[PDB]
Every structure is written in C-alpha cells, then in structure tokens.
Amino acid sequence: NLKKYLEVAKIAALAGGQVLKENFGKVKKENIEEKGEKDFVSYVDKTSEERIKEVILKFFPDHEVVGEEMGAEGSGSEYRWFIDPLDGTKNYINGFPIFAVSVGLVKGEEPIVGAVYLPYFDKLYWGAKGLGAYVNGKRIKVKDNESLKHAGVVYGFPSRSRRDISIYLNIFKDVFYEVGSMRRPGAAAVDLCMVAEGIFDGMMEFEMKPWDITAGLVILKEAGGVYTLVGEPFGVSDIIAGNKALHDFILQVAKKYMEV
Amino acid sequence: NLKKYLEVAKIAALAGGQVLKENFGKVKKENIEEKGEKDFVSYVDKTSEERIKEVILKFFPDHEVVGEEMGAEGSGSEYRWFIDPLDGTKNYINGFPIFAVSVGLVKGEEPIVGAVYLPYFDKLYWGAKGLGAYVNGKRIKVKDNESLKHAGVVYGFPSRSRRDISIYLNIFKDVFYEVGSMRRPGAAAVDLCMVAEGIFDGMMEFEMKPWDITAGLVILKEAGGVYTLVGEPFGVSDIIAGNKALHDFILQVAKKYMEVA
Ligand SMILES: [Mg+2]
Ligand SMILES: [Mg+2]
Ligand SMILES: [Mg+2]
Ligand SMILES: [Mg+2]
C-alpha cells in the first residue's frame, strides 16, 4: 500500500532537486531575502517547493502538502506531506555542497514514507514503513558500534535560538568529551540519512521544524535507528537519534540540561 | 624555481591519495591504533606517508620530510616538507568523505608550495608563492564579502585540549551569534582550501600541528586570504584565517579570551 506513495516521494524530491542543480552557484546577494533574524531564502527554495508540491498533488490531489517556504495546501487530509525544498540553504548559497531536498509523508501522526535527495552527489535516500531504507537502491543500516571513543556524532543548533545558547554548549561539551568526533555539516535531513547509512553513530539537532526531519525519521527507523523527539511534533522540536547506544548516551546527557 | 617543487608536491599528494582511495571503507576496529587520549591511526595513514615521502626524496634527496605518523627524515635542509598523509582520519574511518592528503614545502620559515588532495572527490588544490592558487587547474580566490550575517566560518578544536574547553566555547559562541553559519567538517587542510576557494569567508582552528596547515597556508595566501598563526609554528599553533574582514573579526573575538600576540 505504500509503494506508490514512496515512488512519488522520490520523483517529487528529484523534481525539486533539479531546480537546485540548475541554480547552484548562481544565487547572489541581490536574490537573498531575509527571514527572521538570521534565515535566508531565495527564488531557488521557493521554485523547488512549487515543483515538489505540484508533483505530489497531481498524483494525490486530496493530500495535504506542507512546505517550509509557502506553507500548507490542502483541505484537511490524514495524509500530510512535509517538504523542505532546500535543506542547507546557507551551505547552498556559499557553494558548500551539503544540501538536500526532503520529502516526507505522515499518515495521521506516523511518518510512513521518506525521500531525501542530495543533488550535488546524486544520492537519493529513501524508505517506507516495513519496506526498508536505501541509498540509490543499496540497502542501508545503522552502525553497530557501542564504543563512545569510536563514535561519530553529527550535531546542529541555531544561532539566535529559543533556548539559551549555554544549554546547547553544555550538551555539546559533555558529548564532545566522550565521543571520537563531532561534526556540524549544516543540513539536518542529511545528518539523519548519514546516521541511517551507518556513517555516524548518533545525532542531536535542536529547534527543528517538521519538514526538517519527517523524511529522515522514516529512513532512520527503517535502517534500525532509534530517536527521541522533544517538544511538539508539528511545531518546533528537538531530535536525538542514533543507534541504540549513542541515542541513549546523548539523551542521558541532554537530560541534565533540558527536560526531554 | 618553484615549478618543479610544485609539480612534485602534486605527484606526492596523488601517490598518498591513491592509498586512501584503495582502502576507503576497509579500516576495521582491528586495524585502529590509539595514539594518545582520543587520536586514531591505521596502516592507511602510515602507508600513505611512506609513499609521499618516497616520492619527495626521490626527486629531492637532500630535502627534509616531516610526517605526522613517522616523523622526520633528512639531514638538515633549508627545504622542509610537512606532510599529513590523511587529514580527517576519524572521518575516513567512519566513511564521511571529507578527508585529504596535505603536502607543503617551507623554505626556512616561509611556506612556498602546497598541494592538498581530496581523494574521494578527486579535487587537487595547489599553489606556490607568486604563481597563484588553483583547484584542478581552475584559478581560485577568497570571497569578497564583508557582511557578517552573510559569512560562513569553518571551525575546529580538539576534544582533549591543552586549553580549557571554555575558551573555545566562548570564541565559538561570540562568532556564532554574528555570522550566517558555522560549520565543522573535520579536516583542517580542507577548511583552509574551502576558504581559498571562496566557499567560506573565515576559519578558526585550534591546536594545529605544522603538517595540518602548511600546504593550505600557501594556497590561502595565493588566493588572497590572510591569516594569523598563534603559538609556535613548528609546534602546536592556532590559525585564524579568512578574507580580510572575517580574519579581522574572528581575531578580535579571540583576543578577548586568549593571547593572540
Ligand atoms: Mg529549507
Ligand atoms: Mg531545513
Ligand atoms: Mg593526519
Ligand atoms: Mg591533520
């Protein structure tokens, strides 16, 4: 029952990804709009989102689509798509090629289908409930490691955050002291996929929106990973994820400094 | 006479890079030695270093070569090569493909030639004093931006550090508040090249060794960047680098928390 949703997710992610490909390296300061204090958006994000939404609604006209840049369209369906048309906008504008398109479907409150496309590397991560997780048609799974000194952890948190920065610096410092490496690549959907692929053992990302994480959560769960979502799923949330050992370790650190 | 040194630097970087390409994804826990409190090394790092050194000394048998993993070879020379046979070891072992081979030459105390090879992406950054900086034979230059909110800054510092972690957290937080983005990719030589290429406006990396930075400093300077080295150049140093605007900003932040001389 999920296969058609999954193939459409992938096509929609590719459709937005093509916009990203055609414009990579072309976005000048003249084209950047400010959102809030530190966020940027351009015609690239918005055009990608238009294309993704169009694809999804042509196949599933009664579905709801929720995108970062232009909001929601639909009439109240239990099938809700959460779309980040450009995850890694700052990286994209700078020419740092860690950026993605994220297309995730939830049924009620359960994430069931995900596709995350990295256009610069032509790498498509995908997965659906009960069907497994894949990158370009190779099956993927989280790494088995439980040794903290061998673990790698990806992290992110915003500047000008809702929480005091000290909370994130304290969680960071305690995890940093124990693990082999910590990396901050700047695209949360890609971080989830790299845990799912078995590159990083754990991840902690703060102040996420549902389009940041929905597709990656499907892929992570199908890869055997586990996660904890702190806060409101349809609002601003925090994600702690990994294999079982690193999820548990990061969560126990975070609990000293914030309620989870 | 820099052209012959430069072409050899590139060949040596490729020679080590080929060892990295052949073994990427193959290093198991069995193969990993622990160096200090948190550092790893494997047969891959050491084989890459052997190949790089062999190339350099076949062409320049009287030069000095200094590698991270097996130290120095030579008999005293004005010409000293500083080699990181695998910059980004932890990334490499994990399968995160941001890693490089760094091959830099100093004449006395002046860096004069650099090559940094990213084997996964087959991207060779190279430069020499007065000859420019290049990536795969396209000329490169640092970005012009002076707007902090548009700037991107790459950073790194170690998890068992000589300085108290609070110093690095304080410098980080003050730069983070003002700039558009901060990124931690995990390979200092690659960070220097990404500033040289015009991707990131600035960089701050703490507790570096000379093989981490020599090649990248040549490339950065030929790209029009500027840098400040804090500490002993032939010892453990810190680097603050960027275009002029971001170098100055990051340096002014760091001065609040550490002596930058
Ligand atoms: Mg976005
Ligand atoms: Mg996002
Ligand atoms: Mg090294
Ligand atoms: Mg190094």
Author numbering:
A (entry chain A): 3 to 262
B (entry chain B): 3 to 263
Task: Share the article's original sentences.
The riboflavin biosynthetic pathway is well-studied with dedicated enzymes to perform complex chemical transformations, with the exception of an unknown phosphatase that catalyzes the dephosphorylation of ARAPDP, the product of RibD, to generate 5-amino-6-ribitylamino-pyrimidinedione (ARAPD), the substrate for lumazine synthase. Using an anaerobic activity-based screen, two phosphatases from Aquifex aeolicus were identified that dephosphorylate ARAPDP, but only one reconstitutes riboflavin production in a one-pot experiment with the other four enzymes of riboflavin biosynthesis. The structures of both enzymes were determined by X-ray crystallography to reveal the vastly different folds capable of performing the ARAPDP dephosphorylation chemistry.
The first enzyme, annotated as an IMP, is nonspecific, and indiscriminately dephosphorylates ARAPDP along with ribulose 5-phosphate and NADPH, two required substrates of riboflavin biosynthesis. IMP is reported as an IMP, which is a member of the phosphodiesterase family of enzymes and shares significant homology to the putative target for lithium therapy as a mood stabilizer. The structure determined here was solved to 1.75 Å with two homodimers in the asymmetric unit. Inositol monophosphatases are reported to fold as a α/β/α/β/α penta-layered sandwich that assemble as homodimers. IMP displays that standard fold and PDBePISA calculates an interface surface area of greater than 1700 Å2 between the A and B chains, consistent with stable dimer formation. In addition, the estimated molecular weight in solution was that of a dimer as determined by preparative gel filtration chromatography during purification. Density was observed in the active site for metal ions, but no metals were added during purification or crystallization; therefore, these ions were derived from the heterologous enzyme production in E. coli. Inductively coupled plasma mass spectrometry (ICPMS) was used to unambiguously determine that magnesium is bound to the protein. Whereas reported myo-inositol phosphatase structures have three metals modeled in the active site, the electron density in the IMP active site only supported modeling of two magnesium ions. IMP is unable to facilitate riboflavin formation in combination with the rest of the pathway's enzymes from initial substrates GTP, NADPH, and Ru5P as it indiscriminately dephosphorylates NADPH and Ru5P.
